[PDB]
């Protein structure tokens, strides 16, 4: 009775060998900067957790991005900050330059290095087969680093990947959902955006790990090489699992939930149906044929798997023949 436990197959026990300070973010003391050093230029957007602005560091006259947090539990702000400090300097991790107290909101404001990002909707229409492989490898460097530091991103999606295409620069941003991986810990399944939620979240399996990020990256890859954005376009969280099952098949879905003794929400009874696994070539056509290769499909196939334990790790993914043609460094 109850679900079967699960462990990450890599980087399992990294946090228990660190000192308590590394992962116990509740006791982290935030070192504050000076909010006067930054002038807000224009608002870039806002979600449920923050407001984001382009700003200028008035001292060195450099452009920055300021994330003004909305009031949330102090432990969650400390979690994002402690994760940003732990990962600072890592490959393709956005750099947290400063932390100030916003005088209006009275909440913390995070100052980030600026990236000349082109929005992904316009940019992805111009990416070549080589560009997709190049940037995918760059994303994998960031994911492998943070996984090796005991951290799941949990919100991998195009809007959290800043790309300066003119200078071949890529940064992984928005660590507000990131958590430390502790083996056997049951996590909140309400993470990531709908289109990039792993099946473990969609079936309410709480004991997931880094491999969640690899499913989300597989979603990004499928969307880029097939020119279908997003690839699994569910109308809600339940239709999202149906969308996956229409491509991967219901057989492997039931094998997955049976392995972990998971019981699906009975509202799937009348919507899930019976579907065979589709061959990837059905999504190939004249307009995306130049982005599809045997290597790309094998790689995608090893990422988009129901069983989180069977997906490629970030480190394994970088060894895939899909990246042989990419010049490194």
């Amino acid at each position: 009775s109850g679900p079967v436990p699960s462990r990450a197959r890599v980087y399992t026990d990294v946090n228990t060998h660190r000192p308590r300070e590394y992962w116990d973010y509740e006791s982290h003391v935030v070192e504050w900067g000076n909010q006067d050093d930054y002038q807000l230029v224009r608002k870039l957007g806002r979600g449920k957790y923050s407001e984001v602005f382009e700003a200028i560091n008035i001292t060195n006259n450099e452009k920055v991005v300021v994330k003004i947090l909305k009031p949330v539990k102090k432990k969650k702000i400390k979690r994002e900050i402690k994760i940003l400090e732990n990962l600072r300097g890592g490959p393709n991790i956005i750099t947290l330059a400063d932390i100030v107290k916003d005088p209006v909101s009275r909440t913390p404001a995070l100052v980030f290095e600026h990236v000349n990002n082109t929005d992904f909707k316009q940019l992805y229409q111009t990416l070549t087969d080589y560009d997709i492989r190049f940037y995918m490898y760059e994303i994998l460097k960031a994911l492998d680093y943070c996984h090796s530091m005991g951290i799941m991103h949990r919100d991998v999606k195009p809007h959290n990947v800043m790309i300066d295409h003119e200078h071949r620069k890529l940064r992984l941003i928005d660590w507000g959902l990131a958590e430390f991986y502790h083996p056997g810990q049951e996590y909140n399944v309400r993470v990531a955006s709908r289109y990039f939620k792993g099946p473990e979240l969609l079936v309410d399996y709480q004991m997931y790990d880094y491999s969640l990020d690899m499913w989300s990256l597989g979603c990004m890859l499928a969307s880029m090489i097939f020119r279908k954005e997003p690839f699994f376009h569910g109308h809600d969280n339940y239709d999202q699992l149906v969308r996956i099952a229409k491509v991967l098949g219901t057989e492997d879905l039931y094998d997955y939930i049976d392995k972990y003794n998971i019981e699906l929400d009975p509202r799937f009874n009348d919507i899930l149906g019976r579907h065979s696994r589709k061959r990837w070539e059905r999504f190939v056509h004249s307009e995306n044929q130049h982005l599809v290769s045997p290597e790309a499909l094998d790689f995608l196939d090893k990422l988009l798997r129901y069983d989180h334990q069977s997906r490629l790790t970030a480190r394994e993914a970088m060894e895939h023949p899909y990246f042989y043609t990419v010049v490194k460094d």
């Binding site: 449920k48 539990k73 049951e186 996590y187 309400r190 993470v191 955006s193 709908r194």
Partner: peptide, 7 residues
């Protein structure tokens, strides 16, 4: 976004 976290 489009979801929300606490754990």
């Amino acid at each position: 976004x489009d979801d929300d976290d606490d754990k």
